[PDB]
Ligand binder design. Structure first.
Ligand SMILES: [Ca+2]
Ligand SMILES: [Zn+2]
Ligand SMILES: [Zn+2]
Ligand SMILES: [Zn+2]
Ligand SMILES: [Zn+2]
Ligand SMILES: [Zn+2]
Ligand SMILES: [Zn+2]
Ligand SMILES: [Zn+2]
Length: 262
């Protein structure tokens, strides 16, 4: 409960509450121009209620050739659980993973320093996270090397030719798609997971039969554990450890790996 952690938001969770398409907070939006420095604009989703305190934030990058619309459903789904969610566009649709990581950080720096005051008054600027799809997921890994003070990283069906992530010390949850032919889990997602420190709080979830664009379509299996990961590590909320440890056994999951307990 709140006596043990000033960052806990929302009622005590259940499997139903993390599977729900909306959490307990209502959500408002705010668009950001592509002339924002260091990235290509995007959309900020944020909780409306301020009665429980300020919130952490996650920047969300799209993949190669893609734009923020490929990631829009995370906005209200995750922000309603008590997060500021920033779906961003890249400088160009052909930007590479390192560039996407710089742009995730530029977008977080926008929230902390330049965002509308309705957003800033609800933001804990010290509790920030990254998430992204395909090359944006490669950028998620990149961003945590660039900024080790981030609190969580969620690479979704990630793409990156750089396979070695032993320097990463931000808790990282990689989601792979079993049938991914664009970023095969055997050469992208799983080598990334295996190269993260064995001492790091980390997880890998492989979605049975799923393809590369599974993260661009509302997916309860993705959503429930993205929410649980962000709760546990951006809010330090150990009420969500119950869903992450022991490993999820959802029928939709082909394989799950972790450094549980955490
Ligand atoms: Ca710009
Ligand atoms: Zn508590
Ligand atoms: Zn309330
Ligand atoms: Zn909406
Ligand atoms: Zn790179
Ligand atoms: Zn590297
Ligand atoms: Zn597999
Ligand atoms: Zn399968």
């Amino acid at each position: 409960g709140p006596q043990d952690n000033p960052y806990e938001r929302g009622p005590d969770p259940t499997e139903d509450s993390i599977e729900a398409i909306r959490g307990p907070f209502s959500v408002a939006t705010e668009r950001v121009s592509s002339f924002a420095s260091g990235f290509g604009g995007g959309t900020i989703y944020y909780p409306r209620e301020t009665d429980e305190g300020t919130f952490g934030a996650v920047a969300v990058a799209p993949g190669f050739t893609a734009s923020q619309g490929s990631m829009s459903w995370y906005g209200e789904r995750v922000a309603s659980q008590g997060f500021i969610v920033f779906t961003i566009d890249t400088n160009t649709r052909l930007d590479q993973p390192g560039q996407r990581g710089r742009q995730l950080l530029a977008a977080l720096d926008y929230l902390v320093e330049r965002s509308d005051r309705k957003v800033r008054e609800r933001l804990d600027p010290n509790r920030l996270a990254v998430m992204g799809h395909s090359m944006g997921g490669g950028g998620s890994l990149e961003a945590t090397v660039m900024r080790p003070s981030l609190k969580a990283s969620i690479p979704l069906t990630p793409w990156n030719l750089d396979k070695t992530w032993g320097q990463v010390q931000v808790p990282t949850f990689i989601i792979g798609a079993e049938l991914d032919t664009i970023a095969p889990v055997s050469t992208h997602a799983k080598p990334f997971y295996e190269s993260l420190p064995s001492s790091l709080p980390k997880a890998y979830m492989e979605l049975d039969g799923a393809t590369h664009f599974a993260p661009n379509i509302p997916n309860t299996t993705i959503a429930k554990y993205v929410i649980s990961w962000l709760k546990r590590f951006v809010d330090e909320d150990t009420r969500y450890s119950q869903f992450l440890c022991p490993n999820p056994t959802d029928r939709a999951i082909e394989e799950y790996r972790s450094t549980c307990p955490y």
